[PDB]
Each structure stands twice: as C-alpha cells, then as structure tokens.
Design a protein around this nucleic acid. Structure first.
Lengths: 177, 60, 114, 66, 121, 79
RNA sequence: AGGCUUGUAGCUCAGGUGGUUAGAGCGCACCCCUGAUAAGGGUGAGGUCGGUGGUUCAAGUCCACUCAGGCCUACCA
RNA sequence: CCAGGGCUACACACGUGCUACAAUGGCGCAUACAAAGAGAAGCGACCUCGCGAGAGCAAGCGGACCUCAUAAAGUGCGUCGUAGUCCGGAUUGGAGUCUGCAACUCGACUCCAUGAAGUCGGAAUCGCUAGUAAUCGUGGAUCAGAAUGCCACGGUGAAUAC
RNA sequence: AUCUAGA
RNA sequence: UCCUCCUAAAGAGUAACGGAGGAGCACGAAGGUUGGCUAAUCCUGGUCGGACAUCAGGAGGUUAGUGCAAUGGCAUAAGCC
C-alpha cells in the first residue's frame, strides 16, 4: 500500500530517469505474486494439506486454492487429480501489502542470511525465490506449529527482460547480493 | 593327460620344493637354492625364488 | 525473545536458555548475563523486552548462530585446500587430532557398517 | 475477495526495539513485537563482515614482534 | 593367462590348511604385479584351507612367470591339528595350465558331407 | 600449542633461505627439516621436504605460512 | 514341425491368475558353545524376477518377440 | 656411525578397561573426616600476575618438623522435573601453557565455541562370602614431559549360602 | 558324533 | 458371430488357413441444456523436490484429449470444468 504510494510517484519517476522511456506506460509494474506451496505429502498423510493450506491463509491474506496433478506420474505415486500443492495468486492491493510486508519484516528474519540472490530471474523480468521455513512471517507462533513447511514466492512483473526487472525491485531497495 | 603329468603323486617324496618352518629354510630342488626367508616368501616376494629358475631355464 | 536466529525456551532459567544459540555455551552466557546484567535464574518467560534489548546487542558482540558457521567452515575448507596433513584428514573422515585409528574412531569414521 | 471464507485482515501496529513503527495489515492477532526490520538490521554491515577473513603472514608477525 | 590350481596332498587336514597358505602366497604375488586373480572353484577343507582350489589368474604373461610351480611342495612344520606338538610333513600340489582359447567346434561345410539318400525300412 | 617464545627453525634451513633470497629461483632445495616453521619470506620457493624416502617438493604460499614443513610431506602412503 | 509349460537369491521352490509390497528351506558372512571341528544358539547380507519391445499413471505379472530346458503329438497310405 | 620416517598406519574382527545411559542424579555455594608414600643437574611454600593450565622473585627441607596436599563420596541449602535434557562427553575449530634442541606425522594439560553414539544392552558370559563385593578419592615406580595400565593406600560400606 | 600323519 | 484398417484395381461391392489389431461392455452420469475454457512436449527461474509432484513466464500450436480396437472426424468444438 504505502510502497505502492511510493511506487506511483518515486519508483515510476525513479525508472523514467534510468531507462529513459519516451512513454510512461513502458515502465514496469509488478503484476502479481503467486505464493506456491507444493506440499506433496498428501499421498501418505491426507490431512496434511488442511494445515498446509491453512498456513498460506495466514501468511498471505486470503483462502488458498489446492491444486491437482496435471498428468499422473509414477515416480511419486500420485494419480491424476490428486491434491498435491496449494497456491495463492494474490494481486491488487493485497499484493502491494504482502510485498511491503515481505521486504520489511519477512526478508530480514531469514536465518543464516546472505542477502537475496540476483540470479533468481527467469530471463524475462520475473523474480522467483524460495523460503525455507514459516517463521519469517510473524503469524506463525513457532510454538503452535510442528512442520518444517516452506513456500516459494514468485514475483511477476511486466518488464520485457530481467535487466529491467532487477531495476524495478532494486528501486524498492530489495536486497540483491 | 597333462595335469596328471604335472600334478605329482601327492606323496612327500620331495617334488620341486620344501617349506621348512622350524629351520626357517626354503629349498627349491632345481638350482638348489637355499633361501632362509619364509616371511619374505609367505607374502609373495618369491622373486628370488623364481628368478634363478627362469635364468637356468633360458639356459636351455 | 528472538535473539541471533531463534532462541525459544520454555520455562527454563535464563543462562540455560541462552545456551541454545550456536556460539555460546555455559560460560559465554554468564558473560552475557554478567555484562547485560540479568539475574541467572530468571526465565525468558519472565524476561520482558526492555530487558531483552540489552541482550540482542550483547550476544551480538561475540560471533554467534549466523556468522560462526562460515567462520568454522571457512577454516575447514581452508585446511582442505592447503593439502596439509589435517586437510588430508578432513577429506577422508579420519581423526585429525591424532587418535587411534586401528580399532576405535567410530565417531569420526561413522557407524560400523561394512 | 469473497465473503465468509476468507480470514480476517485487521490492521495492527508494528513495533521493533530499534524505533521504527510501520502499522500493517495481517492476521497476527493483537500486537506486533520485533527486534529487526528492513532497517536496524545488518543488511549493510553484516554483508560487509563475512567477506574479509583471510590473511596469515601478519599472524606470524604477531608472535615474533622483533 | 593361466589356471592356478592347488590340490592338497599328504596330510589331508594339515595340507588342506597349508594349501590355503600357498593360495595366499601366489595371491599375494599376483596382487604385487597387478594381476587379476579370481577363485573359480574352491573345495574347502575341514579346519581351514582347501582340498583343491582352482583359480584363474589373468594378466600380462602370467604363464611364463608362474609355469614353474607345478609339482609337489613339501611342508615341514608343527601343524594346527597337533595336540602333541611334534613336526609333521605334508605336501601340496599345484598345477598351472595356460589360457588356450576356443575356436568353432564344427565346420559344418556341406561340401565335405557325403549325403546318402536311400530307401527307408 | 608449541613454544610461545620463538617460532622455530634450523640454521641449515634458514641460511639456505637467506641465500635463496639473493639466488633468485632454484631447483628444489634438498632439506630434511620438518620441525621448522615456514617463515613468511619463503613464498615463491619450492623446497623439498623429506617424508622418509623421497623429497616431495612443495610451494610455499601465503596460506601455508605458520604451519611447519612436515605438515606438507605425508609420510605413510595409504591405498 | 506344432501345442503347452517352465525360467524368481549361490542351489531347490513359493510370489505370477490378482498390475503399484519380493519371501522359504539349505547354503554364505559375523559373533557365542567347544581343547578344536561338526551339531547347536544369536545376528546378518544377498534379486533389477531368462534377454527384447509395446499397453499402462506403474511391468516380475498383461499381449507379441524370441532364447535355454521339459513333456505330448508327428498318423492312413 | 649419522639425519628423516616408522613401531601411533585402517574396508574389519577379538581381549582387557575408562566414561556414561542419569533425579539413591547433574550443577552452584558453605563445610567436615584419613592412610600410605615420594623429594636436590628434586619437592617447591609465601606473595603477586593470569579466566585457567601456569609465569616472577623465592622461605624451607636430603625431611615425624619443610613440599606435593584443597582428599573425594559425605552433610546443609537452593536449583533442574524426565527432556537425549542443566544426562553423557566423544568429535571438531580457534587461541593457549609446560617440558624438551625439537609438539608436523605423534606429547600431556587449560580456556572458549562444538555437543555426536548412547534410554541398562541378543545368544552367551566373568569376578565376588566380608571390611569382602560395590563405590569414592589419594600415593608410588617407570619418567624431561607422557597413563583410563600396574603397584599400593585409606573413606563409606551391603545382600547372600537351603 | 569325530579328533589323520614324524619320539 | 460382430467392429476397424489393408488387399480392393480414386463410387458401392469383392475371396483366401492373406497381412494387422479389438468386442460379448461401460455410464444415472462419462446423457441434456446453458455458461465458461484450450492442449502434448521442451527451455528459463524457483523449498526440501529429484529426469519425472505444485508455481510463474516463454517456445510450440493439437505432436494432446476423446471410457476401451483402428479408421474417419472433432476449436463454433464432439476435449476440459
């Protein structure tokens, strides 16, 4: 929210000075964020994904979709249509607020922290990182839960290539070692 | 036909060596070698055993 | 109560609770509670945040949970790259400090499998 | 969003010991205590100290002294 | 390559236990010069060692290095199965047969075959 | 862990290093000294330390300074 | 020649019908009993399921294709 | 005769031990109660310094006097509440200290971090009838240093034999 | 159940 | 007995102890209607996660799917919800 209101004035201008766009709508703007959590171990413990989706409902804002096996594989004992990973594609106001709550209280609480990498770009302008635990989010007690469960945030931006998207996030003082 | 000729009668009449542990001595009957080794024979190291036999086999 | 990584005790006295941080055992904890000035048999349940702020910077003096793993691993990985005696012992998992290796050494050399 | 399937999104107030308050919206419950944040954290001094650790000859010089 | 084959002779328990210790001797010799040794068959003894142990040794000129070991080998020692502690004399016998590979056993050449077709009875 | 007063060397090694200062580079300098530490001025040299039967030549580097010479010459040769 | 039926641990066999998981006796390795061996007692490893290719989410199994073994038939002239 | 290495190597097996698995216990403080020994190119107070191994000057004593030498289990008071833990201490990283010409292969000991295997152990199996078994500490020889071994000493102190 | 063969 | 292809000679039909394969069912919804949607397989980045689980983007354009044999079809979709 507040760094959306920092976006619309100083990050738009902050990139209009840099990559000298003759238009304004050529500036990147972050489309959405898709928190995945591919729990996998619903094949053996069926009631695991109840709490594994209930975690994303409290980390993010809203209620998660629980997704299914596309084509069935015998490498992992899943039949097609089996609930194997829960996701939330949050966007709008809640994506600015989850991203704002990401770089403020969630990134610096990572244990044995190096700084987020910069090679986690797909060659398109989309940043995708993975987090190990839950407890970089304050909504988890560390005492109420019992599982080593973690997710992997996927930041989707409308930049053309990732030379541009690294500038878009690094204009939000995103860590980038 | 050949194995019977090479594998001897089995009995102790000396047939092509001894291995004398109380004296410590080894005697190959041909090229009447008198090596006193028996720890330098019982882990390989029969280089000195075989080598004068191949010399006195390339003698003919 | 989140100093240097995690630190979650439960009704445990404070010097025993601060051992949980990698990089401080019993002594260095009494150096914390000596310097930062907390009584020893208080609990981190009782220990409020206006006390903890004197400890989140006090354990931060000596190298703790985070940076000490790459300190230690940096020294080990140094020794392997030297190609000295001891790095030639760290490559293999044989005891560095000159122990018996004929009979003992199942700590360094793993379980008695083969 | 939809109604009566989503959890609450109460705007709560944050607090670290550093002195950096930014109130924010989540489902933590009542209050937010912190110790580090986007500031007051070694993102810029802890990413400086982990690099420089080598150097051995001046160690040997710290034992002769003459 | 060669077939090293140690049969135990006189002293059927003790020289079985000693043919174990000639097989370990050339076993220790073939490992020195880096030759492959492989126990193709081994009739074990009663108290250790073997009554016969035929083991193919391959390598680099195995036969010319080891063709001289065929024959007996008389063994003077105090045995292992000796409760009175006196010397007993035994013998092991070794053979060394060379590699001698295979060629096609029939030449099914029908120009050698006189085909005689006659009436059945 | 050793000898708090005086990092230890031998004169037949040390003066050989002193002459190896002005000699430029050399072939490996046949020394049997293992009980000596490596002074920092030996960097660039290639002295060969006796392991017991052969002299292994080892290049003194900035990492390998306070250690002794016999660190870098493994005696027993396993599998 | 076809027709029917084997092939699974080092050996002898189940497991195959019934598609998702490999077992038994003996042998073998290790430790006890014993003066020492056998017997015995305790502990353990050991398989890509004859090689080849399809179907299937997955082949030891199901269908072809063979390869090595076995039985039966091969008659009227 | 000499220098370096080795007898300390490590896919494993066997023998004897030491430490444990804990709450009749661990830790912190205060405190009590011995025997037997050794000591001069030795034992070494006292006092100071060092977190600690120890370092500086150094009194005494070839000793019933001087030195190692604070005996520990014990008792009192807290504390931890059954957790692989305030159990256990391997293993490792760093800095040390002593002796010795010399501590890399390969010494012992301290401090700080480390904190693994281990929850009484299969078939079998050994010692032990009383100050014994068990447990607790101490001393000597060998020796520059270097014992969990050996040789000795005392503390507490059983159940059992039809 | 057995314990070969050199006083 | 029945279905599909080839033989079958560009309508239909057409034999052989000719070459290849399936059926003796399934489904109260896998039927109807309205509304919505578009694959397979690779590459890049990503928590354990792996060549092969879920995510995001890109390439590709039916190489997918069609309850089951093959042919014919099928995006207006007959495939998916």
């Amino acid at each position: 929210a507040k760094l959306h209101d920092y976006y619309k004035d100083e990050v738009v201008k902050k990139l209009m000075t840099e990559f000298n766009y003759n238009s304004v709508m050529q500036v990147p703007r972050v489309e959405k964020i898709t928190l995945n959590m591919g729990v996998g171990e619903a094949i053996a413990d069926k009631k695991l994904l109840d709490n594994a989706a209930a975690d994303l409902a409290a980390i993010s804002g809203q209620k998660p979709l629980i997704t299914k096996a596309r084509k069935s594989v015998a490498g992992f004992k899943i039949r097609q249509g089996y609930p194997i990973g829960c996701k939330v594609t949050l966007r709008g106001e809640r994506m600015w607020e989850f991203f704002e709550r990401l770089i403020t209280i969630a990134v610096p609480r990572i244990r044995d922290f190096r700084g987020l990498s910069a090679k986690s770009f797909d060659g398109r302008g989309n940043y995708s990182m993975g987090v190990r635990e839950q407890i970089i989010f304050p909504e988890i007690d560390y005492d109420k839960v019992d599982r080593v469960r973690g997710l992997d945030i996927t930041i989707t931006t409308t930049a053309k290539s990732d030379e541009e998207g690294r500038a878009l996030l690094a204009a939000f003082d995103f860590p980038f070692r | 036909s050949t194995r019977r000729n090479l594998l001897g009668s089995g009995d102790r009449s000396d047939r092509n060596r001894t291995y004398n542990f109380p004296q410590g001595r080894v005697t190959d009957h041909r090229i009447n070698l008198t090596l006193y080794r028996l720890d330098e024979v019982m882990e390989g190291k029969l280089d000195m055993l075989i080598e004068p036999i191949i010399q006195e086999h390339q003698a003919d | 109560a989140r100093i240097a990584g995690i630190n979650i005790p439960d009704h445990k006295h404070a010097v025993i609770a601060l051992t949980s941080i990698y990089g401080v055992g019993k002594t260095r904890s009494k150096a914390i509670l000596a310097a930062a000035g907390i009584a020893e048999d208080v609990k981190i349940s009782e220990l409020s945040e206006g006390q903890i702020d004197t400890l989140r910077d006090e354990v931060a003096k000596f190298v703790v949970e985070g940076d000490l793993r790459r300190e230690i691993s940096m020294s080990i990985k140094r020794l392997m790259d030297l190609g000295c005696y001891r790095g030639l012992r760290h490559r293999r998992g044989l005891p560095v400090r000159g122990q018996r290796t004929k009979t003992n050494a199942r700590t360094r050399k793993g379980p008695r499998k083969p | 969003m939809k109604k009566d399937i989503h959890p609450k999104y109460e705007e709560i107030t944050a607090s670290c010991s550093c002195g950096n308050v930014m109130k924010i919206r989540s489902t933590v419950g009542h209050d937010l205590n912190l110790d580090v944040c986007s500031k007051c954290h070694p993102f810029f001094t802890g990413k400086q100290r982990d690099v420089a650790t080598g150097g051995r000859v001046d160690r040997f010089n710290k034992r002769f002294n003459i | 390559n060669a077939f090293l084959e140690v049969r135990a002779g006189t002293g059927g328990d003790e020289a079985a236990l000693f043919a174990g210790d000639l097989f370990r001797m050339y076993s220790r010799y073939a490992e020195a010069r880096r030759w492959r040794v492989e126990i193709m068959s081994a009739s074990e003894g009663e108290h250790g060692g073997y009554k016969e142990i035929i083991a193919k040794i391959s390598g680099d000129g195995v036969y010319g290095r080891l063709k001289f070991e065929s024959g007996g080998h008389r063994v003077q020692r105090v045995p292992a199965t000796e409760s009175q502690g006196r010397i007993h004399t035994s013998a092991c016998t070794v053979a060394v047969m060379p590699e001698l590979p295979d060629a096609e056993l029939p030449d099914i050449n029908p120009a050698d075959l006189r085909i005689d077709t006659f009436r059945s009875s | 862990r050793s000898l708090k007063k005086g990092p230890f060397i031998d004169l037949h090694l040390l003066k050989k290093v002193e002459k190896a200062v002005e000699s430029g580079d050399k072939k490996p300098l046949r020394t049997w000294s293992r009980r000596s530490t490596i002074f920092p001025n030996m960097i660039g040299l290639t002295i060969a330390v006796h392991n017991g039967r052969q002299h292994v030549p080892v290049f003194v580097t900035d990492e390998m300074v306070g250690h002794k010479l016999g660190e870098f010459a493994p005696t027993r040769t396993y599998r």
